[PDB]
Symmetry: D2
Subunit: 250 residues, 4 copies
């Protein structure tokens, strides 16, 4: 089925996670035609500024996420930043996410693959679509069986990312493809591009959502308001239903 | 609003080629009555990379060929001009005067097209940012143009490659009707033509531009990008279907 | 010898041209090791805004330039925008310049070549270095013998140009290469990059200069102050003298 | 200020390779007494594209090899770390800890290097704008780094290509000493190595970084970009000459 990965960018508090998890659980029950995966980062390890919010740490985060899966029975996904974090994270995370800047770090990929969990690699803004083939190979060599590649834009001049949708069919040759709707534009362009992603064809969409994005401690300018999530999901399912007839074979 | 489909052979290889394509476009226009078709073909490829490449048979011959298409099939016509003096003679048959991408900032060319009273469609230069088309529209309005289109055809991305930044569709929509060039946006200065056109209609545009030829392999220009004429019907039906289902979500400008 | 093409961006008045021509004449007499070519546009035919200064027209411009060559005996160069302008311009212009956006317009190139004058083509911001080979061929086919290719930057994302200096040695294979120091950065970067151009190796430099750039009716943010021209020329000659030892053969 | 030349084989293929290169670097250091040389080699290529490519013989072996170079030749040392835990052991031999381009924003890695008391050299990510290195320097200073370098190694330009925006040299100079990577800036993710290094010194930088190997064709990494060791002397003499003549024109930051 279609994958929808969503949740607040960072684990600002297990309290926030529960409120978001409650809504994702509701959509989960409303759209049985979709596999929902709850996402949130226990640490923003690559902020530009040293004086920015990073999080409450790995232990606090894993505990908060554990709570979401127990209170709602939702699959979990979070990102790791160094090899040693794979094991403890794999205790809760159904899908281990690899940050875009780290998509070429062999040991991180191998560490994630060793946990036996699914692995989702964010395509580096510096990577060409065809160069993700080697990323998948690393994961397969490492013992990974469920592999995802996420489109999140490519470097286009300075301080700008462009989404080359030709990447979707190219990456589909060796892995399931997820379109990251919120980081690919980093709000007026979020919906239009997600619509494009599903018209082109992908296996899922990734989107950060927060009750009050403006009050968020991370990606306050791109996180989707929680209340708009249902409408966008219904919209992409309808578009996908009609467009899927034309998705090119492999 | 009636969706616009601009299609035809890239170059006016001969008056016979035009009538063959026009025949099919006319057939499709009767089937897809919700679509406004415009027949396109260039009387001159004035910007080929090589001096040895095919250019055409001249403005005179081309205009006469296009007039035949309009006369024989009752189809609207569009062709591109390369210098100011061509606007007047071309305006005699062209319903929409097209401005080449490299020439989108040539003031006198835009002014020449605008004063003819015909609609003007400007291909967005590969060097131009979406927000910079606002001044292009202002020039045309200044020159008297009342029906203006902006065409997305890709942006320079490294060497010999173009990327389509779909964010340009809603940005340009702020000041003009927007057309998506499905064939030139994948050209490297065919496997991606269809998926990208699906993206264009899902995002939302006012029309699509597609070069089509009975046998692309034998084309005298863009032999690698022109869509086989037999595939045009299927592509149009698909974008109409995608447009309909996505239409309720199109943001208001 | 080394080519130095300079002058005010636009012919704001033959008066301005004479003041600039006076200074270029002085440097001309001071640097016999350099071939100076006076440049100025009779029309800014590609301004973004319709409400911008274009000029005083072709006739006024050709007359003003004619005055510069007669009062100072300096070679002249100006750009054309449509085929019909080549002939009347070739009456004064020693070098006919082709605008960057128009580097692929066959008839314009052929028209310039037909005048028998030298032709300098500004490399389009959209063109790859190796693709200028076809530009030269057009000019040769058209009867041009003295051909120049000018590096003026390449599209790098939106509203930004980057200078890929690998272009200098690539274009040198089929034509003399000129580095445009003022349009490649469109002021703090003008000198550094011209220094780079000569260290890499080129046949000349192009730079717009105006007595009071801020008061200029065009390129007020990039035109080099007239008083700084001598210093930059002396600097590039010194750098070239030392670096030329390492310029790669053809 | 004494110009810095960072050079050595890309990877620590063996302790013998290092001593062979170190021998030549030591010879050149005696000749070019106005230059500060730093011997470089990676104990691990932790980011190769293919899982089948050479990585190295481990941190332990590498550090021991580097210590041999410093011990036998009296040369300063630099190598790169890939995860936080490696900073401590590496700091035992490395005078300058290098931060890989893809990892230039990894806060904990930068902090790990900074607290060792050693100098830190951060390769500017191919995705990073020049003005955004200001925060990189702030992180390092926050972490205790007192000697910081920023290395220019190209920027993503379309697919599989890097361009060097020389405007970054004076921009980055505003907050750190700047090094130009002559070999990685022309790599496609050798004919241009020399001309671009001439440009770097003419623009103005504080040092250059060059990978060099006795027989590049037989290298286990960057076989297409590493400079033959016999050409190192000539290149250094040339940049010193160009630097001298251009030096009086270097703008003040």
């Amino acid at each position: 089925k279609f994958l929808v990965i969503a949740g607040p960018c960072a684990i600002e508090s297990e309290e926030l996670l529960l409120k978001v998890g409650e809504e994702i659980k509701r959509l989960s029950e409303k759209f049985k035609e979709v596999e929902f995966v709850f996402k949130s980062s226990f640490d923003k390890a690559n902020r530009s500024s040293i004086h920015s919010f990073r999080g409450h740490g790995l232990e606090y985060g894993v505990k908060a996420l554990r709570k979401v899966k127990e209170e709602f029975g939702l699959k979990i996904t979070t990102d790791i930043h160094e090899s040693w974090q794979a094991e403890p994270v794999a205790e809760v995370a159904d899908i281990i996410q690899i940050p875009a800047f780290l998509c070429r770090q062999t040991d991180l990929l191998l560490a994630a693959a060793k946990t036996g969990r699914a692995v989702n690699v964010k395509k580096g803004q510096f990577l060409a679509p065809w160069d993700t083939k080697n990323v998948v190979e690393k994961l397969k060599f490492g013992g990974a069986k469920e592999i995802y590649l996420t489109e999140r834009g490519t470097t286009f001049g300075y301080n700008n990312l462009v989404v080359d949708f030709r990447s979707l069919p190219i990456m589909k040759q060796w892995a399931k493809v997820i379109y990251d709707a919120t980081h690919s534009v980093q709000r007026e362009f979020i919906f239009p591009l997600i619509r494009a992603a599903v018209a082109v064809g992908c296996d899922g969409v990734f989107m950060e959502t927060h009750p009050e994005p403006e009050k968020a401690l991370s990606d306050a300018s791109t996180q989707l308001p929680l209340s708009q999530l249902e409408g966008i999901i219904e919209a992409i399912l309808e578009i996908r239903e009609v467009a899927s007839k034309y998705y090119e074979t492999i």
